[PDB]
Amino acid sequence: SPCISQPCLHNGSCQDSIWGYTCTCSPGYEGSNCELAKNECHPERTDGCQHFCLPGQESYTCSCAQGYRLGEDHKQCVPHDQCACGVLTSEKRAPDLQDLPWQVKLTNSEGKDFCGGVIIRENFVLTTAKCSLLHRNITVKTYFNRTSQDPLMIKITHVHVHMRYDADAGENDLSLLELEWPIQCPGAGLPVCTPEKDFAEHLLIPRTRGLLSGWARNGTDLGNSLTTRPVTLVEGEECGQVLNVTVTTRTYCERSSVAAMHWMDGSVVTREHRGSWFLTGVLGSQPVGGQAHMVLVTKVSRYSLWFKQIMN
Amino acid sequence: SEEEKAWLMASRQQLAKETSNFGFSLLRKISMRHDGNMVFSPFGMSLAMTGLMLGATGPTETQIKRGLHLQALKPTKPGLLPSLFKGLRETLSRNLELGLTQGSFAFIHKDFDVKETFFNLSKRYFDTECVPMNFRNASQAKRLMNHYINKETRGKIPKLFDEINPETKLILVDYILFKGKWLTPFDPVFTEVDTFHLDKYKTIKVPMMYGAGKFASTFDKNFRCHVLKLPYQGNATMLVVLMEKMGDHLALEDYLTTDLVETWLRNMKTRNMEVFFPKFKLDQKYEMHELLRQMGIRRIFSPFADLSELSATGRNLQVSRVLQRTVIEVDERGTEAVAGILSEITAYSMPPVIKVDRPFHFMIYEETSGMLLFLGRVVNPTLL
């Protein structure tokens, strides 16, 4: 022991400590094993960027999410707006308690709740296209930090339905909802983070669990009981047969073994990374082979441009 | 009639604009099925389908016309095809400067009537020798076809087919191969193995051609991408679309319209610049009918299709398969036997640079007609 594994590749200077080892990789490298490079981006890099990374020529570069700025660190993401998808210091497991700021319900001409949605920005709410289209007087309703008696009501000025949406093909089932007034954050609520494609598909979805926040329908206990649930990626291959469905390149699958019909469509999956939550999926009309434990989500990481174009 | 010709001239352009929009719809349906390298011919695809739209009637024929984004053309009967079938001629005929192996086949069942009408009239337009086959002796049928093609293609396409259902009414193939002569070939002294980011987290090493001098380009500040014109010989051109460093190329596909392409074709500005471009070679076959179904063209691939005009014999005649094989290669010399020579006179050491080291889209159109020959996407220069 211990420098026997030769664990230091790429000219790694093995400093044999007494209980573990250490390395001093050949110039232009890093890591406890030297498997990294200041050249590219590796998912394993712990001391890397807090949010988004860009493989550079010499070293890599760090970008930040909506509402953040980089500290003098050039790697850190100091939140300052303030509207930046940070879940208050609050742990929630078996007791979901409906206390996440970005979740939202949709009502029509009467108190009827028919769909869910997510705050994407102070004045925009994301949801499925199918839902956005079955009523012409949609209103946004949030209970975050509010007496259950009266919720927060906001009228929907205009609904931007994705331009490549085909209901038949069930593809691009997504809409953006323009709020009459901005959400008074962080009090009234708070937008969730929207991730860059590569980041979201290389270190988020494959490498960590997410939780599926929504509501079951059509039923409840005469109230708004937001029920969450851990989920993991299902390899599209298997997912194919298991649901008797063809997985396009803008959808993926999740599973939990809790046999709950997350009927509410605006239900969404999210994953957190270094203390920030990222919208990873939006729950289409997952069907019909249920098999309720496995779910079919719309890959939000793909519609990054569509957001910027519409919301600016 | 001289009446017809007067029309065909104004309809040249409208037809080109429309099958480019048809081409971008196709590209999108394909992009739904995978993220890898992609390449196909919008033009060869419309040309082929249009031939069928001839032998079709009513609901069938009508649906094809709409599906090809050109129900707006309101002509007399077959004139619609001569546009496409004769555009095919002008390209393979007097134009040797480019490519351009191209052709199609209609391997039909050995019992269809095929009157002396749409058989000679269609041969006058399509010029695609139909070939009655023994889809019963499936094993024999495969060999024959692969051979027929292995011939008219000159070994370029070896064995196109793998299987064949015993009950195959009609199969339709279309191939197109291309590699041209650069207007300004790249200096092989300068091509070096360089870094190519297959994506932000994975990268590889690929041969990177280098070229300097005058190029026409433009940067769309809205979607934030570079557009670069690489001129071939024979008035064919290649548009290279390269998103800024952060943004993803897959997003841009949703926004590709003929209007966009031409709006930044006009904002083109020719100037001195350096360009790094990766060698590659895409070869792909698509079962187009499966895709053209998802796009709305369904009836002509289904039992109740009306090919009555083609072959009145009524059992269950219908296009069974449509498949396009297309190949395109890009080194620094092309079809020329020697490559190019770089001489530096601009003169400066600070001209704009443009490295194609991320995935990108490329289009290949004939500057003359504006017709889209090749719609493609290169995510991994190493395979294909």
Ligand SMILES: *[C@@H]1O[C@H](CO)[C@@H](O)[C@H](O)[C@H]1NC(C)=O
């Ligand atoms: C570093 O690795 C190379 C691999 O070729 C090896 O030849 C060399 O001996 C190593 N250098 C040192 C200082 O051990």
Ligand SMILES: *[C@@H]1O[C@H](CO)[C@@H](O)[C@H](O)[C@H]1NC(C)=O
């Ligand atoms: C629709 O929404 C408005 C508020 O914008 C509300 O006053 C009205 O009661 C609703 N009903 C209908 C049917 O429009």
Ligand SMILES: *[C@@H]1O[C@H](CO)[C@@H](O)[C@H](O)[C@H]1NC(C)=O
């Ligand atoms: C509302 O939000 C404020 C600020 O977070 C908090 O102090 C208060 O307790 C919350 N309660 C209600 C019912 O609004």
Ligand SMILES: *[C@@H]1O[C@H](CO)[C@@H](O)[C@H](O)[C@H]1NC(C)=O
């Ligand atoms: C779809 O699922 C059903 C389940 O009974 C199966 O019969 C059918 O073959 C499937 N279609 C496929 C796999 O394309």
Ligand SMILES: *[C@@H]1O[C@H](CO)[C@@H](O)[C@H](O)[C@H]1NC(C)=O
């Ligand atoms: C198929 O039919 C042809 C008819 O010429 C015959 O020569 C050939 O042997 C047959 N193939 C097989 C596998 O028997």
Ligand SMILES: *[C@@H]1O[C@H](CO)[C@@H](O)[C@H](O)[C@H]1NC(C)=O
């Ligand atoms: C054709 O292509 C050549 C390429 O040198 C170009 O100079 C010319 O303007 C184009 N025009 C016509 C009508 O051929």
